Write an enzyme that holds these catalytic residues in place. Structure first.
Site, PDB file in Angstrom:
ATOM      1  N   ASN A   1      28.837  26.477 -24.720  1.00 40.73           N
ATOM      2  CA  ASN A   1      29.158  26.437 -26.153  1.00 40.73           C
ATOM      3  C   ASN A   1      30.596  26.028 -26.311  1.00 40.73           C
ATOM      4  O   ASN A   1      31.532  26.569 -25.690  1.00 40.73           O
ATOM      5  CB  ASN A   1      29.185  27.883 -26.681  1.00 40.73           C
ATOM      6  CG  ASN A   1      27.822  28.531 -26.875  1.00 40.73           C
ATOM      7  OD1 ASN A   1      27.811  29.662 -27.433  1.00 40.73           O
ATOM      8  ND2 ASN A   1      26.713  28.001 -26.289  1.00 40.73           N
TER       9      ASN A   1
ATOM     10  N   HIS B   1      27.163  21.936 -26.373  1.00 40.98           N
ATOM     11  CA  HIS B   1      26.764  21.692 -27.724  1.00 40.98           C
ATOM     12  C   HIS B   1      27.692  22.399 -28.668  1.00 40.98           C
ATOM     13  O   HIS B   1      28.450  23.293 -28.287  1.00 40.98           O
ATOM     14  CB  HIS B   1      25.287  22.094 -28.011  1.00 40.98           C
ATOM     15  CG  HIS B   1      25.084  23.587 -27.812  1.00 40.98           C
ATOM     16  ND1 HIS B   1      25.372  24.529 -28.792  1.00 40.98           N
ATOM     17  CD2 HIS B   1      24.703  24.292 -26.713  1.00 40.98           C
ATOM     18  CE1 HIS B   1      25.121  25.743 -28.309  1.00 40.98           C
ATOM     19  NE2 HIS B   1      24.695  25.628 -27.063  1.00 40.98           N
TER      20      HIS B   1
ATOM     21  N   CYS C   1      23.968  27.705 -21.815  1.00 42.75           N
ATOM     22  CA  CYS C   1      24.660  26.531 -22.281  1.00 42.75           C
ATOM     23  C   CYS C   1      26.183  26.648 -22.327  1.00 42.75           C
ATOM     24  O   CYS C   1      26.755  27.746 -22.359  1.00 42.75           O
ATOM     25  CB  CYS C   1      24.190  26.181 -23.694  1.00 42.75           C
ATOM     26  SG  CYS C   1      22.480  25.470 -23.702  1.00 42.75           S
TER      27      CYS C   1
ATOM     28  N   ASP D   1       0.906  -1.137   0.000  1.00 46.14           N
ATOM     29  CA  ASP D   1       0.000   0.000   0.000  1.00 46.14           C
ATOM     30  C   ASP D   1       0.961   1.205   0.000  1.00 46.14           C
ATOM     31  O   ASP D   1       1.680   1.418   0.971  1.00 46.14           O
ATOM     32  CB  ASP D   1      -0.871   0.018   1.277  1.00 46.14           C
ATOM     33  CG  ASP D   1      -1.973   1.054   1.220  1.00 46.14           C
ATOM     34  OD1 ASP D   1      -1.902   1.994   0.366  1.00 46.14           O
ATOM     35  OD2 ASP D   1      -2.957   0.934   2.020  1.00 46.14           O
TER      36      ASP D   1
ATOM     37  N   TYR E   1      14.996  32.376 -27.273  1.00 48.86           N
ATOM     38  CA  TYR E   1      15.786  31.796 -28.408  1.00 48.86           C
ATOM     39  C   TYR E   1      15.029  30.566 -28.923  1.00 48.86           C
ATOM     40  O   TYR E   1      14.163  29.993 -28.233  1.00 48.86           O
ATOM     41  CB  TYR E   1      17.210  31.387 -27.949  1.00 48.86           C
ATOM     42  CG  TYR E   1      17.232  30.507 -26.755  1.00 48.86           C
ATOM     43  CD1 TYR E   1      17.094  29.107 -26.886  1.00 48.86           C
ATOM     44  CD2 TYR E   1      17.430  31.033 -25.486  1.00 48.86           C
ATOM     45  CE1 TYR E   1      17.115  28.264 -25.736  1.00 48.86           C
ATOM     46  CE2 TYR E   1      17.411  30.166 -24.270  1.00 48.86           C
ATOM     47  CZ  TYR E   1      17.284  28.807 -24.473  1.00 48.86           C
ATOM     48  OH  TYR E   1      17.253  28.050 -23.323  1.00 48.86           O
TER      49      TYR E   1
ATOM     50  N   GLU F   1      -2.845   5.710   0.968  1.00 48.68           N
ATOM     51  CA  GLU F   1      -4.256   5.883   0.584  1.00 48.68           C
ATOM     52  C   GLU F   1      -4.861   4.767  -0.305  1.00 48.68           C
ATOM     53  O   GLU F   1      -5.738   5.007  -1.175  1.00 48.68           O
ATOM     54  CB  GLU F   1      -4.491   7.310   0.023  1.00 48.68           C
ATOM     55  CG  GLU F   1      -4.172   8.379   1.137  1.00 48.68           C
ATOM     56  CD  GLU F   1      -3.999   9.828   0.586  1.00 48.68           C
ATOM     57  OE1 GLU F   1      -3.516  10.697   1.380  1.00 48.68           O
ATOM     58  OE2 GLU F   1      -4.337  10.092  -0.617  1.00 48.68           O
ATOM     59  N   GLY F   2      -4.414   3.529  -0.069  1.00 49.01           N
ATOM     60  CA  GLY F   2      -4.950   2.377  -0.845  1.00 49.01           C
ATOM     61  C   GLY F   2      -4.614   2.350  -2.340  1.00 49.01           C
ATOM     62  O   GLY F   2      -5.347   1.749  -3.159  1.00 49.01           O
TER      63      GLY F   2
ATOM     64  N   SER G   1      16.895  22.016 -16.591  1.00 42.53           N
ATOM     65  CA  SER G   1      16.670  23.456 -16.724  1.00 42.53           C
ATOM     66  C   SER G   1      17.128  23.981 -18.086  1.00 42.53           C
ATOM     67  O   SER G   1      16.849  25.151 -18.433  1.00 42.53           O
ATOM     68  CB  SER G   1      17.397  24.190 -15.652  1.00 42.53           C
ATOM     69  OG  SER G   1      18.803  24.201 -15.720  1.00 42.53           O
ATOM     70  N   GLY G   2      17.775  23.124 -18.873  1.00 39.21           N
ATOM     71  CA  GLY G   2      18.030  23.419 -20.299  1.00 39.21           C
ATOM     72  C   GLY G   2      19.460  23.757 -20.584  1.00 39.21           C
ATOM     73  O   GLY G   2      19.742  24.414 -21.625  1.00 39.21           O
TER      74      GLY G   2
HETATM   75  N1  LIG Z   1      21.433  29.490 -26.301  1.00 41.45           N
HETATM   76  C1  LIG Z   1      22.550  29.597 -25.315  1.00 41.45           C
HETATM   77  C2  LIG Z   1      22.459  28.825 -24.028  1.00 41.45           C
HETATM   78  C3  LIG Z   1      21.200  28.025 -23.753  1.00 41.45           C
HETATM   79  C4  LIG Z   1      20.358  28.578 -22.716  1.00 41.45           C
HETATM   80  C5  LIG Z   1      20.095  27.631 -21.565  1.00 41.45           C
HETATM   81  N2  LIG Z   1      21.201  27.260 -20.762  1.00 41.45           N
HETATM   82  C6  LIG Z   1      19.164  28.142 -20.486  1.00 41.45           C
HETATM   83  O1  LIG Z   1      19.036  27.445 -19.485  1.00 41.45           O
HETATM   84  O2  LIG Z   1      18.580  29.230 -20.633  1.00 41.45           O
HETATM   85  C7  LIG Z   1      23.611  29.059 -26.307  1.00 41.45           C
HETATM   86  O3  LIG Z   1      23.758  27.920 -26.539  1.00 41.45           O
HETATM   87  O4  LIG Z   1      24.344  29.786 -26.984  1.00 41.45           O
END
Ligand SMILES: N[C@@H](CCC[C@@H]([NH3+])C(=O)O)C(=O)O
Ligand SMILES: N[C@H](CCC(=O)O)C(=O)O
Length: 258
Positions: free
Chosen positions: A207, A187, A205, A83, A169, A86-87, A182-183
């Site tokens: 870069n 890259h 990010c 359980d 962006y 709450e079942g 959070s993104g």
């Molecule tokens: N566009 C940026 C960084 C990415 C934004 C991201 N980290 C965020 O959490 O807002 C770049 O790559 O040049």
């Protein structure tokens, strides 16, 4: 009235030294204590760890320090007949076996603007980087490597920032390795090669050059670590999804089952 558990990493995966055990459920868990008691984790070599809930459906387990390379981990989620509060009862039992690979830790130091990748302590690559500019800084802290994309669009509206607004962006990138929910990603950024190693120009990010991004994509794996230091930002939240290691051990160990 049944809940299905889901466990990661996947069965048989080789992951880096930062990868937590994650158990997610398709329903909110009312009795976190019952859930924790149903989850058995065995490690070899044996290491102490503890549970910490990231939200109402997801619990994590990790040791105090990063895993030792070669560790084998077995996870048994035995929620049938339990359980979960709450079942709401477990729909099934789920198991996973995984292993820890090499220790790969990449440190991005805003003082030098270099991201240095170390494998079992030795430097293997030093990449010039351009991180978040001061008005949109990259947070400091320990980030766990997540998924990897040969090409994707990063769109700020995913994160509640309209594409039309000043910090917005909608950006096509190659060789993108995700390091926060959070993104933040590492890259390819051919548009910032001048700035890389000198000036931060991104929205957060890391870069790097197209060749360095492809190298990272080819060589870093889920659970490896990127640590950002000395930026003007705050600290990545422990509950980000890939920011578990930012929560101090005494707080993690103590838990939040309630
Ligand atoms: N566009 C940026 C960084 C990415 C934004 C991201 N980290 C965020 O959490 O807002 C770049 O790559 O040049
Ligand atoms: N809009 C892109 C950046 C997306 C992130 O940065 C640029 O000016 O190159």
């Amino acid at each position: 009235h049944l809940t299905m558990p889901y466990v990661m990493p996947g069965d048989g995966e080789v992951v880096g030294v930062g990868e937590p055990v994650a158990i997610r459920f398709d329903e909110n868990i009312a009795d976190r204590g019952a859930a924790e008691k149903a989850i058995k984790i065995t490690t070899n070599p044996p290491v102490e760890g503890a549970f910490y809930w990231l939200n109402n459906r997801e619990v994590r387990w990790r040791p105090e320090h990063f895993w030792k390379p070669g560790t084998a981990v077995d996870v048994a989620v035995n929620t049938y007949g339990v359980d979960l509060g709450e079942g709401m009862f477990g729909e099934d039992n789920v198991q996973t076996h995984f292993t820890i690979g090499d220790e790969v830790i990449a440190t991005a130091d805003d003082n030098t603007k270099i991201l240095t990748v170390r494998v079992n302590g030795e430097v293997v690559k030093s990449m010039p980087t351009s991180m978040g500019k001061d008005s949109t800084p990259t947070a400091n802290g320990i980030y766990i490597v997540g998924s990897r994309y040969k090409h994707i669009i990063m769109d700020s509206s995913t994160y509640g920032v309209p594409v039309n607004s000043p910090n917005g962006y909608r950006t096509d990138v190659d060789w993108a390795t995700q390091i926060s929910y959070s993104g933040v990603f590492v890259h390819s950024a051919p548009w910032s090669v001048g700035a890389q190693g000198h000036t931060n120009t991104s929205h957060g990010c890391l870069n790097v050059s197209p060749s360095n991004a492809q190298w990272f994509y080819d060589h870093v794996k889920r659970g490896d670590i990127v640590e950002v230091v000395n930026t003007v930002g705050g600290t990545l939240p422990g509950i980000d999804g890939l920011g578990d290691w930012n929560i101090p051990w005494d707080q993690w160990r103590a838990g939040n089952a309630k």
